[PDB]
Scaffold this active site. Structure first.
Site, short mmCIF file in Angstrom:
data_model
loop_
_atom_site.label_atom_id
_atom_site.label_comp_id
_atom_site.label_asym_id
_atom_site.label_seq_id
_atom_site.Cartn_x
_atom_site.Cartn_y
_atom_site.Cartn_z
N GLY A 1 24.38 -23.56 39.28
CA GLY A 1 25.46 -23.31 38.32
C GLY A 1 25.17 -22.17 37.36
CG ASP B 1 24.25 -12.36 45.28
OD1 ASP B 1 25.50 -12.38 45.39
OD2 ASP B 1 23.58 -13.35 44.93
CG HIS C 1 25.79 -16.33 45.50
ND1 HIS C 1 24.86 -15.58 44.82
CD2 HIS C 1 26.09 -17.43 44.76
CE1 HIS C 1 24.57 -16.26 43.72
NE2 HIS C 1 25.31 -17.37 43.62
CE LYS D 1 -0.24 -10.75 45.56
NZ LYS D 1 -0.64 -9.81 46.65
NE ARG D 2 2.84 -16.27 43.33
CZ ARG D 2 1.57 -16.19 43.71
NH1 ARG D 2 1.19 -16.61 44.91
NH2 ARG D 2 0.66 -15.71 42.87
CE1 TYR D 3 11.58 -17.95 46.91
CE2 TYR D 3 10.77 -16.45 45.23
CZ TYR D 3 11.44 -17.61 45.58
OH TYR D 3 11.98 -18.43 44.62
NE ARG D 4 3.09 -16.20 56.00
CZ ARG D 4 2.45 -16.91 56.93
NH1 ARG D 4 2.28 -18.22 56.78
NH2 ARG D 4 1.99 -16.32 58.03
CB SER E 1 24.19 -18.29 40.85
OG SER E 1 25.46 -18.80 41.24
N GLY E 2 25.15 -15.79 38.99
CA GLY E 2 26.16 -14.83 38.54
C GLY E 2 25.97 -14.45 37.09
C1 LIG Z 1 32.06 -29.53 37.43
O1 LIG Z 1 31.72 -28.25 37.98
C2 LIG Z 1 30.58 -28.15 38.75
O2 LIG Z 1 29.88 -29.12 39.01
N1 LIG Z 1 30.32 -26.82 39.13
C3 LIG Z 1 29.25 -26.32 39.89
C4 LIG Z 1 28.23 -27.18 40.36
C5 LIG Z 1 27.17 -26.68 41.13
C6 LIG Z 1 27.14 -25.32 41.49
C7 LIG Z 1 26.09 -24.80 42.36
C8 LIG Z 1 25.47 -25.64 43.30
C9 LIG Z 1 24.51 -25.07 44.14
N2 LIG Z 1 24.17 -23.76 44.11
C10 LIG Z 1 24.81 -22.97 43.20
C11 LIG Z 1 24.54 -21.47 43.22
C12 LIG Z 1 25.19 -20.79 44.46
C13 LIG Z 1 26.68 -21.07 44.54
C14 LIG Z 1 27.55 -20.47 43.62
C15 LIG Z 1 28.92 -20.77 43.65
C16 LIG Z 1 29.42 -21.70 44.57
C17 LIG Z 1 28.54 -22.33 45.47
C18 LIG Z 1 27.17 -22.02 45.45
N3 LIG Z 1 23.13 -21.13 43.17
C19 LIG Z 1 22.42 -21.15 41.99
O3 LIG Z 1 22.91 -21.42 40.89
C20 LIG Z 1 20.97 -20.74 42.13
C21 LIG Z 1 20.65 -19.62 41.12
C22 LIG Z 1 19.17 -19.21 41.10
C23 LIG Z 1 18.24 -20.44 40.95
C24 LIG Z 1 16.77 -20.01 40.90
N4 LIG Z 1 15.91 -21.14 40.70
C25 LIG Z 1 18.53 -21.47 42.07
C26 LIG Z 1 20.00 -21.93 42.03
C27 LIG Z 1 25.80 -23.44 42.35
C28 LIG Z 1 28.17 -24.46 41.05
C29 LIG Z 1 29.20 -24.95 40.23
#
Ligand SMILES: COC(=O)Nc1ccc(-c2ccnc([C@H](Cc3ccccc3)NC(=O)[C@H]3CC[C@H](CN)CC3)c2)cc1
Length: 238
Positions: free
Chosen positions: A186, A93, A44, A160-163, A188-189
């Site tokens: 931020g 993913d 993603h 159960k947590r993700y209906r 993620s990955g």
């Molecule tokens: C100055 O640089 C700067 O601000 N960078 C920057 C800021 C904000 C984001 C960001 C925002 C919103 N969603 C994400 C990603 C998905 C994504 C990944 C890459 C690009 C777009 C979306 N999803 C998550 O992290 C989940 C992980 C599991 C968690 C479980 N509770 C919930 C959150 C990242 C990334 C980089």
């Protein structure tokens, strides 16, 4: 990371910060070193990423402030996204970044072991999620790499947590019933690293969740053990 603390330098030496250069340079996602030219991360992360030319992998980083224009990085030769991937919520993913040059291993940067196929039955009790992500829903990318210890949850409990969602066996969940500690925007990955028999294993890839550290909403991760053959297919290609 919500409810975590600052990491010590060299604590998670497989942890990388993936930066994008388009339109301006910023942290995009976390990732893990798994081989000398290989980063494992989430598919993603590459939404709208048209070329590997805009990507920079920084290893051996504790603080984002260590990154300046004169800071060395690894270029990305190729982005390999699982071909069944549609969206984080549906699974698959997972992505590999093939680096343009070889990572020199040392005390600041080295690989994390992938899980063993035989170890699909082992119960991990010492799991940590790391990243430069938000500490609360609306925050900013953190300077210092954060860490939080999170318990693994069964897929039946996670379902159960993700209906309304389908939690597959290719996903793994981690969180406290009352919340408080979790991955956030931020992170993620990045890795979900578990210590077993004094060896750290890459158990999960931070993927998705409903908000951050909410009660009865554990973080959902790519279950790495279910992708070991796919990783070897891609990294050991003849
Ligand atoms: C100055 O640089 C700067 O601000 N960078 C920057 C800021 C904000 C984001 C960001 C925002 C919103 N969603 C994400 C990603 C998905 C994504 C990944 C890459 C690009 C777009 C979306 N999803 C998550 O992290 C989940 C992980 C599991 C968690 C479980 N509770 C919930 C959150 C990242 C990334 C980089």
């Amino acid at each position: 990371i919500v409810g975590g603390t600052a990491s010590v330098r060299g604590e998670w030496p497989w942890q990388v910060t993936l930066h994008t250069t388009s339109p301006t340079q910023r942290h995009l996602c976390g990732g893990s070193i798994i081989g000398n030219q290989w980063i494992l991360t989430a598919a993603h992360c590459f939404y709208g990423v048209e070329s590997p030319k805009i990507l920079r992998v920084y290893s051996g980083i504790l603080n984002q402030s260590e990154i300046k224009e004169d800071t060395s990085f690894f270029g990305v030769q190729e982005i390999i996204i699982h071909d069944q991937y549609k969206m984080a919520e549906s699974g698959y993913d997972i992505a590999l970044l093939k680096l343009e040059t070889t990572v020199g291993y040392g005390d600041s940067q080295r690989p994390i072991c992938l899980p063993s196929k035989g170890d699909r039955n082992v119960i991990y009790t010492d799991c940590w999620v790391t990243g430069w992500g938000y500490r609360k829903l609306r925050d900013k990318i953190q300077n210092t790499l954060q860490k939080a210890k999170i318990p693994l949850v069964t897929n039946e409990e996670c379902q159960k947590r993700y209906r309304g969602h389908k939690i597959t066996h290719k996903m793994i969940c981690a969180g406290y019933r009352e919340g408080g500690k979790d991955a956030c925007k931020g992170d993620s990955g990045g890795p979900l690293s578990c210590k077993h028999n004094e060896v750290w294993h890459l158990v999960g890839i931070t993927s998705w969740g409903e908000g951050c550290a909410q009660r009865e909403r554990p973080g959902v991760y790519t279950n790495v053990v279910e992708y070991v053959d796919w990783i070897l297919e891609k990294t050991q290609a003849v």
